[PDB]
Antibody, heavy 224, light 214 residues
């Protein structure tokens, strides 16, 4: 089969230019159209453009036509996406896709639709620097079902991983998706519902890890 | 530009049921070049249907494409546990390719009222100058719920941000977390901090509240 391997994720400051690569391995690289499809967090898919390497026929979407540049390197079977004048609203996952073939090889006409996708490339456009999170305790109230947790506030960039009691606590745990605060820093919450009777006997510590800033916080949560 | 409008936005069905999803084009799609994709969280889209009706090798026969012109339809004969995801429709009849906004297919279950909790800002965070009050809506269905912040019984609007977890693989419910963020100064100007939640499974709006320092 064919597979597309994209470059790693990167963070770019607003106004700069980013270049995403996409290496293809399998069928003919020259006669099948290579496209780029981005997707903002939580939002839908958006077609950006495509290129047919054999005749170098590119086709851009009018929304990006002017700062986008898609080329195809037939020497290394690698397509390149260059996005200029970056702005925070371009923060998305960039996918490289290639049109499918009719079944298999040699006698295989192109079908147009995207049958082969890359693993994706995360591009975060922000004017923020790497910052470790502050972990504050969401203490349970003074039946039946009591809630506690830890607030993971003001960090950059994604992601942050949270476990409970070194992983020994999983049942009833909810780690919500992070939100982008106006400060340009992320903030998530990790809660857990437990029996009220266990509040005064069971120790609840949350393990918060933030790889980019190399931060590891074990915050203990107890009733006020 | 061709505009694709998918319907409905969300699809509440149960495993074993038939699912039909609609895709309406603004203008006629040339040569019926309409495709259907499936996407799960943290994963690239997967080609289900192309050419409005053809199905690539490796796709279950419960997926069938139909329709022509401006009206297209994806049909799942019998829903399977892993078929609950997001489904996008794409036209490529014109050179300029466009997508729909997508249709989420969720598991439908009995309406469940959320268990509401409220969390005052920690003494630790108050030393930094900021105050974050966290309202938690635990295990509810459907996803449609409203959270309104009230400080000294006054509708707060523009200082809160909420996020929702994906539908649980066990009880098929959702959980919402809304965080109200004030400065320490503004926080100490008031007393009663309350979060009001309105949901289908609740006859009357439920309000959870605390008094600052009490």
């Amino acid at each position: 089969q064919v597979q597309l391997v994209q470059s790693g994720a990167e963070v770019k400051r607003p106004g700069s230019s980013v270049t995403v690569s996409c290496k293809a391995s399998g069928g003919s690289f020259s006669t099948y159209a290579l496209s780029w499809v981005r997707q903002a967090p939580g939002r839908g898919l958006e077609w950006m453009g495509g290129v047919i390497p054999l005749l170098t026929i590119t086709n851009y979407a009018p929304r990006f036509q002017g700062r986008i540049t898609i080329t195809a390197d037939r020497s290394t079977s690698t397509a390149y996406l260059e996005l200029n004048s970056l702005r925070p609203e371009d923060t998305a996952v960039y996918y490289c896709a290639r049109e499918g073939t009719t079944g298999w090889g040699w006698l295989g006409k192109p079908i147009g639709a995207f049958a082969h996708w890359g693993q994706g490339t995360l591009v975060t456009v922000s004017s923020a620097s790497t910052k470790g999170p502050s972990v504050f305790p969401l203490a349970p109230s003074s039946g039946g079902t009591a809630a506690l947790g830890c607030l993971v506030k003001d960090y950059f960039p994604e992601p942050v991983t949270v476990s409970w009691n070194s992983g020994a606590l999983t049942s009833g745990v909810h780690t919500f998706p992070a939100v982008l605060q106006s400060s340009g820093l992320y903030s998530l919450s990790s809660v857990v519902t437990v029996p009220s009777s266990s509040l005064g006997t069971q120790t609840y510590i949350c393990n918060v890890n933030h790889k980019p800033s190399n931060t590891k916080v074990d915050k203990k949560v107890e009733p006020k | 530009e061709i505009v694709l409008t998918q319907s409905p936005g969300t699809q509440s069905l149960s495993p074993g049921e038939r699912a039909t999803l609609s895709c309406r084009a603004s203008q006629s799609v040339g040569n019926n070049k309409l495709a259907w994709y499936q996407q799960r969280p943290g994963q690239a889209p997967r080609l289900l249907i192309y050419g409005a009706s053809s199905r690539p090798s490796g796709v279950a026969d419960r997926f069938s494409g139909s329709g022509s012109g401006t009206d297209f339809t994806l049909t799942i004969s019998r829903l399977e546990p892993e078929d609950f995801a997001v489904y996008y429709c794409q036209q490529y009849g014109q050179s300029l390719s466009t997508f729909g906004q997508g249709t989420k297919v969720e598991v439908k279950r009995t309406v469940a009222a959320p268990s509401v909790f409220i969390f005052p800002p920690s003494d630790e965070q108050l030393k930094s100058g900021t105050a974050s009050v966290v309202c938690l809506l635990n295990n509810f269905y459907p996803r449609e719920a409203k959270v309104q912040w009230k400080v000294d019984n006054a509708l707060q609007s523009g200082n809160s941000q909420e996020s929702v977890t994906e539908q649980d693989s066990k009880d098929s419910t959702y959980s919402l977390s809304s965080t109200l963020t004030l400065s320490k100064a503004d926080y100490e100007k008031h007393k009663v901090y309350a979060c009001e939640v309105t949901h289908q499974g609740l006859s009357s709006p439920v309000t959870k509240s605390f008094n600052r320092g009490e």
